[PDB]
Amino acid sequence: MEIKRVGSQASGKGPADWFTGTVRIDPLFQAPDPALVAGASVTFEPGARTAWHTHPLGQTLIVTAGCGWAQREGGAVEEIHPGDVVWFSPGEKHWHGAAPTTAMTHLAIQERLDGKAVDWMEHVTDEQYRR
Amino acid sequence: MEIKRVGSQASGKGPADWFTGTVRIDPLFQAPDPALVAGASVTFEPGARTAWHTHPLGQTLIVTAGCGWAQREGGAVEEIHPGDVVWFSPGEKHWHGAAPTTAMTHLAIQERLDGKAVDWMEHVTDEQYRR
Amino acid sequence: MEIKRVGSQASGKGPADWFTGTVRIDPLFQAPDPALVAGASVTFEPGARTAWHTHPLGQTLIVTAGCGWAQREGGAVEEIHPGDVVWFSPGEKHWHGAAPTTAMTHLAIQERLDGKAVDWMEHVTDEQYRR
Amino acid sequence: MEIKRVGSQASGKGPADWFTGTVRIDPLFQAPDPALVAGASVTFEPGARTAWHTHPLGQTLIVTAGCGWAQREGGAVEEIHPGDVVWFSPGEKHWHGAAPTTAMTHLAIQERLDGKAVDWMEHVTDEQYRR
Ligand SMILES: [Mn+2]
Ligand SMILES: [Mn+2]
Numbered sequence: 024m025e026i027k028r029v030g031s032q033a034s035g036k037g038p039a040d041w042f043t044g045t046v047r048i049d050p051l052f053q054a055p056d057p058a059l060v061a062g063a064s065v066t067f068e069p070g071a072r073t074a075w076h077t078h079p080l081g082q083t084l085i086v087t088a089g090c091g092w093a094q095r096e097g098g099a100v101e102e103i104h105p106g107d108v109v110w111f112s113p114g115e116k117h118w119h120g121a122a123p124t125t126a127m128t129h130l131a132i133q134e135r136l137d138g139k140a141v142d143w144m145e146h147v148t149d150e151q152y153r154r
Numbered sequence: 155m156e157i158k159r160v161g162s163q164a165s166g167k168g169p170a171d172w173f174t175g176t177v178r179i180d181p182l183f184q185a186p187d188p189a190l191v192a193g194a195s196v197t198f199e200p201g202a203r204t205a206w207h208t209h210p211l212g213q214t215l216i217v218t219a220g221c222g223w224a225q226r227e228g229g230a231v232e233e234i235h236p237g238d239v240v241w242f243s244p245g246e247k248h249w250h251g252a253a254p255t256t257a258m259t260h261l262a263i264q265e266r267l268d269g270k271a272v273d274w275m276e277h278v279t280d281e282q283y284r285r
Numbered sequence: 286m287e288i289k290r291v292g293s294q295a296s297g298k299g300p301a302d303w304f305t306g307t308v309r310i311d312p313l314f315q316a317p318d319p320a321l322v323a324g325a326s327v328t329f330e331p332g333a334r335t336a337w338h339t340h341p342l343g344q345t346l347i348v349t350a351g352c353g354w355a356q357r358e359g360g361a362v363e364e365i366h367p368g369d370v371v372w373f374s375p376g377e378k379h380w381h382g383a384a385p386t387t388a389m390t391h392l393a394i395q396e397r398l399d400g401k402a403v404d405w406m407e408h409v410t411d412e413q414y415r416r
Numbered sequence: 417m418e419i420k421r422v423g424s425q426a427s428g429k430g431p432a433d434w435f436t437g438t439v440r441i442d443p444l445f446q447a448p449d450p451a452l453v454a455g456a457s458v459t460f461e462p463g464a465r466t467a468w469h470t471h472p473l474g475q476t477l478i479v480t481a482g483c484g485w486a487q488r489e490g491g492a493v494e495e496i497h498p499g500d501v502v503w504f505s506p507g508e509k510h511w512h513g514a515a516p517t518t519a520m521t522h523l524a525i526q527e528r529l530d531g532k533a534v535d536w537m538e539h540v541t542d543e544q545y546r547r
């Protein structure tokens with residue numbers, strides 16, 4: 024047993040290849056072998072969102088604050104709220120972020136395959152970023 | 155892409171075989187193959203706690219509300235707070251719960267191994283629940 | 286500067302005359318004079334709710350967990366979600382609590398008028414609760 | 417009567433005269449007369465904090481995420497953690513904000529006295545922010 028106390032895991036920023044706009048990532052856990060699962064709290068500023076991407080064993084999102092958008096490829100752009108729970112299937116191309124006027128914060132949970140829990144792709148355009 | 159909207163998953167109660175005291179279990183997500191991760195929000199009334207148990211692939215707690223206790227065997231009873239992230243190793247024997255006078259809620263995340271994500275053991279006695 | 290610290294204030298049961306069902310009250314603050322504002326976190330088990338009541342200077346609810354219901358007399362029963370802000374106008378007879386199968390938690394903020402912040406009335410019947 | 421659903425109030429940025437660093441203000445509520453209370457959710461990025469200021473009827477903080485620092489003048493700087501409640505007296509000169517490397521979110525609740533909730537004084541210097 025070990026405890027990572029509050030404020031002991033520093034906030035980091037979203038790298039510009041992977042996110043449009045201002046995103047802060049607050050690491051929560053990365054579970055050692057034989058566990059595969061990792062999680063972090065991600066906070067998007069108004070207008071911010073991830074580039075298109077996929078997850079090898081999928082990801083679950085648990086919204087914890089604010090109001091944001093999310094779309095799987097060829098689906099519609101959905102609105103998500105605190106308490107909402109999202110599932111993206113393995114390989115499903117998708118994106119998620121804040122709404123244009125409000126921040127959003129979510130817990131993102133995903134299992135790694137190699138040492139690889141995400142595949143990044145093209146950014147989400149302004150044209151694509153609408154509802 | 156699937157969304158479980160807030161309020162669409164019924165609250166449930168912890169069965170007396172697995173818990174001392176009153177415990178509410180709010181499921182959040184589970185599975186499906188090939189992914190293995192499951193999660194729930196677990197709320198303990200003051201004085202309530204899990205029985206001793208283990209997890210075949212480990213467990214992460216993210217404390218979301220109140221103030222609880224937790225102890226691995228051989229360890230001291232720790233006090234945990236919101237924003238604390240707690241990890242128990244695969245096979246590690248332990249219990250978690252509320253403190254005597256305050257409720258505690260946490261996000262419990264674990265991976266399943268051939269069907270189960272917990273092995274239940276004896277109750278935590280009143281003498282053991284002391285710190 | 287006074288800080289209380291999480292875990293430091295003990296939880297309480299909502300008295301039977303003011304609540305139907307199982308309610309937990311986690312006190313937060315009570316400002317001294319000349320300020321008038323008080324706040325508590327209130328947690329309603331499924332199907333639990335306040336009696337009908339009024340607040341002499343209105344009340345603001347900030348839902349923090351779960352899914353609840355609320356109504357003023359002659360109005361529709363509405364769902365309240367985490368992140369929602371609910372305002373009850375001064376003297377308006379109302380009730381608020383859990384949805385019938387999901388718990389919920391809210392921050393209740395109200396100002397006291399002559400050393401009182403609520404007036405308690407009859408319980409909300411099972412019919413009024415649904416209808 | 418009224419319910420402001422989550423993503424319906426646009427996030428705002430803290431003005432440069434009142435904050436050091438990047439700060440987001442999410443408005444929550446302002447009670448109309450004869451009530452005097454108002455509330456916002458304020459999110460400080462790592463290193464960001466308010467200027468020195470006072471409140472005419474005092475202020476209540478309820479930390480909701482992350483990890484932050486606070487100091488009334490003549491006092492030590494204190495850590496505040498999620499679920500902590502902080503009280504500042506009317507007229508008490510003080511500041512609050514993020515820790516140097518972790519962001520922080522809190523609920524700020526204060527009452528207005530003839531239409532003002534705060535009086536703004538000088539910025540907090542890098543030297544005062546240490547200790
Ligand atoms: Mn994703
Ligand atoms: Mn466990």
Ligand SMILES: [Mn+2]
Binds near residue numbers: 338340344373379
């Ligand atoms: Mn009320």
Ligand SMILES: [Mn+2]
Binds near residue numbers: 510511512
């Ligand atoms: Mn202040």
